[PDB]
């Protein structure tokens, strides 16, 4: 039904199938060492597969990203136990910088590496903790990542579609359907992840580390390129400084193609701004304008159906939540209100 997902899932699978360092059996031993708080052991295990003579010349994006995944779980782990990985693992930093170069991504593991680029099988899936709650956490992202990527494409396409065209309503309805996957992710996360286990056992693995003289944030669904989609959709011309800073903070962590989309739309009115302007010019007596606006409103509804429950999810875990969440929620409500005002 959501036919556009396939190509994105296939691209994810290529990295997930790659094991260029033959590290699968080794990384699977990491959870045990974490449980034992065995820092020398963790370093020792990493040094069993960490390249010491640079990267094999034949590697492309896929191998480099897969290598970063496998090294990456050791990064979050060492930091969890209170150590900067670059400080305790000799020769690690040059490898991380080389892998960053090869992938055009930060010099550590990101959400992509630990979720959609991470194989799904029990005898292959990499994990910090080996806990079922972590497996559920990763599953929650896998539910919606490909759909979100498809949704970014649909949003960019919709940008150039006239509100006067029947296509506007059709594409918006299609966009809504892909975004529904985000809602499904939160339902799954709320049902299957223990807040206590998340806060006490998982959260400590996602702390920032220092590489190349700056700090890089750990993996999180906050790195999902939803903020890029919404930049195009409603946020590009926002004067909200904190919101602007949020986007600029996470921009480095998303795929190069999405950083390019972000740049393309920064100096432009957002989709909503163009659509509402077109509606005032043409009038809502045009049925395609009415239907377009109504369909657009449903896109905002689904975004709110992700964002509101997510805030509850976050609050429950953190009661064992960051102000930015509430602030973004308020901005989203205001965006929807603009669409609703245009229909009155
Ligand atoms: C128990 C599970 C979860 C917890 C505790 C949690 C917590 C948080 C927190 C505290 C933030 C604010 C930024 C930060 O401090 O990192 C955030 C942001 C965010 N999270 Fe989650 N999260 C969870 C699950 C998820 C899931 C399953 C998804 C989607 C698959 C998701 C998507 C996002 C997105 C897109 C943001 C950026 C803000 C926004 O768009 O509203 N989170 N999360
Ligand atoms: N920081 C929150 C919660 C979180 C931390 N690590 C992961 C991994 C996968 C999904 C969510 C999270 C966030 O970014 O959503």
Swiss-Prot record:
In its UniProt record, which GO terms are filed under biological process? antibiotic biosynthetic process; L-tryptophan catabolic process to kynurenine
Q: Where does substrate bind?
A: 219-222, 318
Q: What happens when the gene is disrupted?
A: Cells lacking this gene lose the ability to produce pyrrolnitrin.
Which pathway is it part of? Antibiotic biosynthesis
Catalytic activity reads: 7-chloro-L-tryptophan + AH2 + O2 = monodechloroaminopyrrolnitrin + A + CO2 + 2 H2O
Question: InterPro entries this protein is in?
Answer: PrnB, Trp/Indoleamine_2_3_dOase-like
Q: Where does heme bind?
A: 310
| Cofactor field | heme b
Keyword check for Nucleotide-binding: no
**Keywords of the record:** Antibiotic biosynthesis, Heme, Iron, Metal-binding, Oxidoreductase
- Enzyme Commission identifier(s): 1.14.19.-
Transmembrane helix as UniProt keyword: no
Q: Name one GO molecular function term.
A: metal ion binding
The entry describes its oligomerization and partners as:
Monomer.
Q: Which family does it belong to?
A: Belongs to the PrnB family.
| Function according to Swiss-Prot or TrEMBL | Involved in the biosynthesis of the antifungal antibiotic pyrrolnitrin. Catalyzes the ring rearrangement and decarboxylation to convert 7-chloro-L-tryptophan (7-CLT) to monodechloroaminopyrrolnitrin (MDA). It can also use 7-chloro-D-tryptophan, but 7-chloro-L-tryptophan is the preferred natural enantiomer.
| Protein name from the UniProt record | Monodechloroaminopyrrolnitrin synthase PrnB
Native organism is Pseudomonas fluorescens
């Amino acid at each position: 039904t959501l036919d556009r997902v396939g190509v994105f899932a296939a691209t994810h699978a290529a990295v997930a199938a790659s094991d260029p360092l033959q590290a699968r059996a080794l990384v699977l031993q990491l959870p045990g060492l974490n449980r034992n708080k065995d820092v020398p052991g963790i370093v020792g295990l990493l040094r069993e597969f960490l390249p010491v003579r640079g990267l094999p010349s034949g590697w492309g994006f896929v191998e480099a990203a897969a290598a970063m995944r496998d090294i990456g779980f050791f990064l979050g782990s060492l930091k969890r136990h209170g150590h900067e990985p670059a400080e305790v693992v000799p020769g690690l930093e040059p490898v991380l910088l080389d892998l960053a170069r090869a992938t055009n991504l930060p010099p550590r593991e990101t959400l992509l590496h630990v979720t959609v680029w991470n194989p799904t099988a029990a005898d292959a899936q990499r994990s910090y903790t080996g806990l079922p709650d972590e497996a559920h956490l990763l599953e929650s992202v896998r539910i919606s990542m490909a759909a979100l990527e498809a949704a970014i494409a649909l949003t960019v396409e919709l940008f150039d579609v006239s509100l006067r065209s029947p296509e506007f309503a059709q594409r918006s309805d299609e966009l809504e359907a892909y975004l529904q996957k985000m809602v499904e992710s939160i339902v799954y996360a709320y049902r299957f992840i223990s807040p206590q286990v998340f806060y006490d056992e998982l959260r400590p693995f996602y702390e920032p580390i220092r590489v190349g003289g700056q700090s890089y944030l750990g993996p999180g669904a906050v790195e999902m390129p939803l903020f890029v989609l919404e930049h195009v959709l409603w946020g590009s011309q926002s004067d909200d400084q904190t919101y602007r800073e949020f986007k600029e903070t996470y921009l480095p962590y998303v795929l190069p193609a999405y950083r390019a989309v972000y740049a393309r739309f920064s100096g432009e009115p957002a989709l909503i701004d163009r659509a509402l302007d077109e509606a005032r010019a043409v009038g809502t007596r045009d049925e395609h304008v009415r239907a377009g606006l109504t369909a657009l409103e449903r896109v905002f509804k689904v975004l709110l159906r992700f964002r509101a429950p997510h805030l509850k999810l976050a609050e429950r875990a953190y009661e064992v939540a960051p102000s930015m969440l509430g602030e973004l929620l308020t901005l989203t409500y205001a965006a929807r209100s603009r669409v609703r005002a245009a229909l009155d």
